[PDB]
Amino acid sequence: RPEPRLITILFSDIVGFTRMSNALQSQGVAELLNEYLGEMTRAVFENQGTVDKFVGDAIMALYGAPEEMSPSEQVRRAIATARQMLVALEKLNQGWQERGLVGEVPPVRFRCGIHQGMAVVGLFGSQERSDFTAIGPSVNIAARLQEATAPNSIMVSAMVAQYVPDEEIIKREFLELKGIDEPVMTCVINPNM
């Protein structure tokens, strides 16, 4: 049965994928995407994370579920992952650049949002089709954060930022998010430790 517990959600999403989605065609789109994702999942698994699901060119990773994890660990790994994924993106662009797969098309950039809160975690769906995911306001914030941030940046919430030295806090500022009544305190963190 799905039950509530504290977890950290991370969303990674490629910017403007739809554009290059043309003039790159089938093979191009499949080959690039499959590779992009190969690295990103690698980044998640290495940081003890869990790949909840892919949503188009987006990734949804969890920390703290299904395997119990300490609040500090949850955020520390999630951030390590976000910083790691970025390092892969710069190199993949270096791999696709000398392949022509990039360039009437720019390199690939992603938006990342991280949050920590409660969520009803467990198997959702029917007895014919059910997947393991996290449901709840907390998830929506993680998603909304990722969407509100600038390309090639990591935007966490205050809940997350508290485990982050203010020195690594590039930009603090409230922001109204879609579907969230109370304005959230967002924190754009530094890509480097």
Where on the chain is the footprint of ligand APC (CB under 6 A)?
A: 13-19, 55-58, 60, 133-135, 139-140, 143, 179
Question: 14 labelled as ligand-binding?
Answer: yes
Nearer to Ca ion, 5 or 109 (CB): 109
80: number of Cβ within 10 Å: 16
How far, in Å, are 15, 34, 116, 117, 175 from residue 136 at the CA level? Answer: 25, 29, 12, 9, 20
Where would I find the beta strands (DSSP E) of the chain? 3-14, 50-55, 58-63, 110-125, 130-135, 153-157, 169-175, 184-189
* 13 is known to lie in a ligand binding site: yes
Rule CB under 5 A: choose which of 13, 155, 186, 187 binds Mg ion: 13
Q: Decide if residue 52 touches Ca ion (CB under 5 A).
A: no
**Mutual orientation of helices 25-46 and 71-97 as an angle, nearest 10°?**
150
CB of 190 to a copy of itself, least distance (A): 28
To which H or E segment does residue 162 belong? none
Considering only CA atoms, give the Rg of the chain. Answer: 17
Nearer to a copy of itself, 14 or 189 (CB): 14
Does residue 38 touch a copy of itself according to CB under 8 A?
Answer: yes
Residue labelled with tokens 């060119």: 57
Instruction: Give the footprint of Mg ion on this chain (CB under 5 A).
Output: 13
| Residues at the interface with a copy of itself (CB under 8 A) | 1-4, 18, 21-22, 25-27, 29-30, 33-34, 37-38, 41-42, 45, 51, 53-57, 120, 122, 124-131, 133, 135-137, 139-140, 179
